[PDB]
Amino acid sequence: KSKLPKPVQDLIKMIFDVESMKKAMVEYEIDLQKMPLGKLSKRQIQAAYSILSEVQQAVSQGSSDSQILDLSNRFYTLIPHDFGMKKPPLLNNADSVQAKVEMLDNLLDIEVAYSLLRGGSDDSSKDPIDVNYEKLKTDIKVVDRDSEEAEIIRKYVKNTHATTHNAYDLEVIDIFKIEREGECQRYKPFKQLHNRRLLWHGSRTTNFAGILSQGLRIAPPEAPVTGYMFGKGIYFADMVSKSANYCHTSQGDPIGLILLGEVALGNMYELKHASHISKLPKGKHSVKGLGKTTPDPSANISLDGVDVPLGTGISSGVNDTSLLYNEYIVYDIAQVNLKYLLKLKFNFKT
Amino acid sequence: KSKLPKPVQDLIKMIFDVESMKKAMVEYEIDLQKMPLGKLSKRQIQAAYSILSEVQQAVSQGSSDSQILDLSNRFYTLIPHDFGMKKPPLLNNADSVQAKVEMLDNLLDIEVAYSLLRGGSDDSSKDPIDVNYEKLKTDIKVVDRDSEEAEIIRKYVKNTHATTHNAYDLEVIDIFKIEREGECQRYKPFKQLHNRRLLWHGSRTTNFAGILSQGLRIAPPEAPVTGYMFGKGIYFADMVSKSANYCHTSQGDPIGLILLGEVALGNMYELKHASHISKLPKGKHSVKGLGKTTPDPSANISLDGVDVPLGTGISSGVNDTSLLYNEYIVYDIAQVNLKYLLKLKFNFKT
Amino acid sequence: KSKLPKPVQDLIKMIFDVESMKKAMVEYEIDLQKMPLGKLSKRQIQAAYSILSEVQQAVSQGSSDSQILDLSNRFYTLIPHDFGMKKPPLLNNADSVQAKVEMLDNLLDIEVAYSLLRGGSDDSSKDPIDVNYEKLKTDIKVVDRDSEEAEIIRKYVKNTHATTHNAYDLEVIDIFKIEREGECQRYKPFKQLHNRRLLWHGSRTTNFAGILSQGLRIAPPEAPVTGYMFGKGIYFADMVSKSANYCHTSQGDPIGLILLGEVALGNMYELKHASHISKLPKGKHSVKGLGKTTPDPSANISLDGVDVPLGTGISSGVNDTSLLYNEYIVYDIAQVNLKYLLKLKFNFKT
Amino acid sequence: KSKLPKPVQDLIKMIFDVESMKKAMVEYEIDLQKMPLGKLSKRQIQAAYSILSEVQQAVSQGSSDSQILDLSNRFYTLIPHDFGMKKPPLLNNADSVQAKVEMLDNLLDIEVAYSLLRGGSDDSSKDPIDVNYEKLKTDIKVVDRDSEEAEIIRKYVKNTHATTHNAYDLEVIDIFKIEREGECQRYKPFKQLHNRRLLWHGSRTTNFAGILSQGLRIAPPEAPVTGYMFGKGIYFADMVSKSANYCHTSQGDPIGLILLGEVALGNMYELKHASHISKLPKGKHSVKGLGKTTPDPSANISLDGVDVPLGTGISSGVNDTSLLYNEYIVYDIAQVNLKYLLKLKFNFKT
Ligand SMILES: NC(=O)c1cccc2ncc(-c3ccc(Cl)cc3)nc12
Ligand SMILES: NC(=O)c1cccc2ncc(-c3ccc(Cl)cc3)nc12
Numbered sequence A, B, C, D: 001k002s003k004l005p006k007p008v009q010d011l012i013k014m015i016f017d018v019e020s021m022k023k024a025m026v027e028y029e030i031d032l033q034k035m036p037l038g039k040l041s042k043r044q045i046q047a048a049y050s051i052l053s054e055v056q057q058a059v060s061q062g063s064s065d066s067q068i069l070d071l072s073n074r075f076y077t078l079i080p081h082d083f084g085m086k087k088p089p090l091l092n093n094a095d096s097v098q099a100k101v102e103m104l105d106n107l108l109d110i111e112v113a114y115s116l117l118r119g120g121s122d123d124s125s126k127d128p129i130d131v132n133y134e135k136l137k138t139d140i141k142v143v144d145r146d147s148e149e150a151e152i153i154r155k156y157v158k159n160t161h162a163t164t165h166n167a168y169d170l171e172v173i174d175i176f177k178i179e180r181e182g183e184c185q186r187y188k189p190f191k192q193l194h195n196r197r198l199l200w201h202g203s204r205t206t207n208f209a210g211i212l213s214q215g216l217r218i219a220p221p222e223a224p225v226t227g228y229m230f231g232k233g234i235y236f237a238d239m240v241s242k243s244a245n246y247c248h249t250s251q252g253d254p255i256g257l258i259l260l261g262e263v264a265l266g267n268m269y270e271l272k273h274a275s276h277i278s279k280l281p282k283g284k285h286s287v288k289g290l291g292k293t294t295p296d297p298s299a300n301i302s303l304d305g306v307d308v309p310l311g312t313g314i315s316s317g318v319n320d321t322s323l324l325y326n327e328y329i330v331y332d333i334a335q336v337n338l339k340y341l342l343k344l345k346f347n348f349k350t
């Protein structure tokens, strides 16, 4: 039925916990009585995403309340909502839509874990976990907290944690040398570039499912342009906390998982002001966003090629930037490979 | 029974309407249970505001994370919210905080209608109505549907209806020549001030009972300063529709109330960009926001010592501004003196 | 000699100083020996204007050394310059191409005072002063150092003398009453507009002959819009010293002339930033640049009606705007009506 | 006579012609009468630097008119000028000082030359050439026209010659391989940095005597930051034409001198908008100005650690940058090792 160490089990389930996946669709106010996990789909969410963009060009170009209104109505039709007896919010405030973008985004992954799990259960193998874990196509290699590799990972978390995120705290618990389904032959031609470094990348536990079926993806095409500060692409941080801030956990759930991986940054194009990048300047490969504080460069290990900014993040010279901390964004899925997949508690400050 | 011309009665009961008030609070995601309508308090609200003002300051300074945490919990608790099955919408985005600034503004009058309501269950000289009528300390004397005034007033409504404001059609149902007791007395000084014209003012119907009672009021000190495009004051539009857009009358409640008052402006301070200010430049008595559309002035009829921009919408010749229509914002509750109240029906083309 | 008040004569002996003309040109580095005073022409200078304009819509719009080099040539050949053994300045520094604008302006005026100065002023009856007077086609009368009028002027002068302009002390020598032949008939329409004030206007003395003959003109079309802060129009001030800084007086020539005209402002367009107006917004009849300082408003007095801003300088509530002091620009020449022409002597601190 | 190859003999005499020195002094209107070479002085020029920056602070911090006038006086009273019969320019244009930064910069070297040229003149043996050659304390050797290096340097020129610089062609009259005494080891410590490359530097001929004897240096402490775009440092280009322009040659004086040095940039703090740097963001070594057009990135030609941008100039993604071409700044003089010296003729068609 099984064999995976306890920590692996406490994981394989979280990934397919069809229960939570519901409490999540609920959080976004969905009428789970017309839009259940069973009738989800990329191609549908995609239509949702597209409606959202036809609303960005709406306000911007200045559109008749009629048009603004129609749009908002279609969106709430192709994506049912359960408000109760309260007036359905408006979608013409940029902030309003962005809220929806975040929503539609966290959804994408969900459609996977289910449709991906709504089958494959026939050849009587082992306990439910094995039949799923197997389809992960990800050798969830195990790591020891008292050997070598992990030894370093310890340092990372501890230091890369911002002073402005003192609303909770971390506590290393599980390290697992995750290894995708041959994403190796993919990230190899992307060695031809300097700048190999391990950065974070947090998310919602309900998401870490498809993050393995076909790793970190970039906002599909139909996504709104002004949806991201540096455009549609994979985002990374050299500050654990900041990336943790993307786990979204409450007092009754101080236990989400994070991830660590290296990207082929090559020659990074660093901005200090928001820009919805479409094409990289010729010669450039990635984009860095200079924040007001940064892992002290004076100190930071490395090896095997990759680099690690694990120095008491101090204040950089940049002082006309909008960001508070750094950001790294590459625009080619094949320009990244996942190495380790942590997980720790968030014991807040209620 | 009653001694108010039929229409004036349908009005008394409409604004002093029991059920609607509760119908209005629920939709705001308020938990009637823990938040009993008969428990609203003038100070209980001003306490809420200040929480918001602190929530937007620290957010516009990327301060700490233990600010939104604590501050968010507090608010939702002071003002009992029943998200039912949804997750408490953190007020971090510094955007959903505005929708909150709004609600309170509303709650303010709701709170006044009630108190004012619950205070005359004693003597019984006439129908409940007439009793609640002597409470608005105002003279609501109907206007002869067929006369100059109606013609003027009605033509005003029709002419300054803006195009981009398509989704609803307007049709005057009845005009009321209101006269708040004493308003005439404090407005007296300001009539020696040049530049005073009839502008519009919309609002939810459950706020009128308190408006006719204590008149138009600025946001309290406690409320944020970045809550209103041009600071805390009494707003006015010269575009009927624009001001009607603030009645929030839906398919279910197709009729709202619009207020026509006389404003002592004088030396206006032009602006094309939103600028949250707390004071006027020397020699400045009001602030005027420039819209790309405005009433043609060559048609500014002068109701004896008062102007009326009944001039059909036209191009102002300004274009680098961020307003599609004008706004007038006074900062002394005395510079105002309401003259007309009107009932209208909204014909939606959704 | 002549039946003209001694004073009126000295004013004439002033404006009609030919030698002082060449002096100007010289200070500009012009080659009199190639461009003799008697060789000036309006089309020349005008055609010179377009070159500067052509540099604008070229220089900053991205250019080629060849062009700037070429256009700079076309310019310097068209208008001779003597720099001696020193490679002549190349037009492409904005501040550089800008002086040429300040240069050309002063030039267009010299030519007018010149062609006028000699067109038929050598008759029997009376001498030159008398003959050249009538050329001015403007009544000129003396005002007494005791007339309520003079007391207003003097008051207006000393009170509105800015504080940054501390490099000289003023002293009114001879006040004069004037009236251009047929300007009243030209100002009659606007004579019935609102907001009329006594604003200043400073100019180089050897320009007056043309002004008292042609009235204050607008920089010809062919001038780059960018060569002027608020588009091409007439400029006035409420700080005597702001327009006085334009009389181009040295110690050699410490006595200058300044104007007090009646301008029909109407609806001003309150701008605090700079823009190169080409068209005006509806209803607008002028533009008023906002400055950090301004005359005290409650100090405004009135002479014959016209609001005169003789109120001691005050800090305005508009601090961010570019201008340190106010400005007024009208774009139709008929909105101005010269009344008083002063004759004051600077006391320098150079 | 001199035992040095004639070509070298020409450069020594050229960069020591006391006449072309004076031609310089006059180029700036400097009064040679009351301000002759022999009277120049390190202390003097420096003191004017302080004044020059006084004009900066006082101008960007405001003040009044009387002060601006006094500082200029103090400047001219220090460095005598002869403005013929023109109006003595006023320094306040915030860039009218820039032209003075240039002057004072030149004056320092011009002064140096003269000083070296007199500390060892009354000697006897060979032509004063070998006498001045040794004073430079820098080995100079001719690079054979058909020397492999020659084909590379020339390639660089013809390739990195900007298209907007079409007001002159370029021909390499001479190529030199110089080696300043001492500079080989004060640079050694920076030979460990990364991104060491060949970059251009163009300056005045009368300026080279000191440059070879003191090496390229950064503006003094007294000197004002406002005089430079990215602060006091040593600048470089990768577009020979860009550096060419700084040789200030004319149809009269067509021959100029430009340098090729290998700068140790390391980790560049890349900007794209004018900024007067003070501190260099941690981890940053140099500064890079981004240009709209740039030497083809995939054409780089490395020479052991030292990269060479000889690729034709094409376009880079950057479009919001304020620059037309790249730029390079190091804020430590020891971070630059001079290598070659070209003597080239310009070819204008004017
Ligand atoms: N993923 C990270 O750890 C992460 C690190 C750093 C910056 C990020 N900026 C935006 C987002 C982001 C998160 C969720 C969604 Cl839906 C869109 C963008 N993530 C980020
Ligand atoms: N209501 C009007 O007639 C009105 C007219 C013009 C401008 C306004 N700007 C802001 C608000 C406003 C609306 C809702 C809330 Cl809660 C606060 C302010 N109202 C306005």
Ligand SMILES: NC(=O)c1cccc2ncc(-c3ccc(Cl)cc3)nc12
Pocket: C101, C102, C103, C105, C106, C200, C201, C202, C203, C235, C236, C237, C242, C243, C244, C246, C327, C328
């Ligand atoms: N003329 C005034 O008295 C005067 C008053 C007020 C503002 C002005 N702004 C610019 C110029 C101005 C002056 C000379 C040149 Cl050549 C161009 C513009 N004059 C002004």
Ligand SMILES: NC(=O)c1cccc2ncc(-c3ccc(Cl)cc3)nc12
Pocket: D101, D102, D103, D105, D106, D200, D201, D202, D203, D235, D236, D237, D242, D243, D244, D246, D327, D328
């Ligand atoms: N030297 C170059 O070829 C050169 C290349 C690139 C940028 C430069 N920016 C400023 C200056 C500069 C140097 C001295 C002075 Cl006085 C003024 C400007 N030179 C530069």
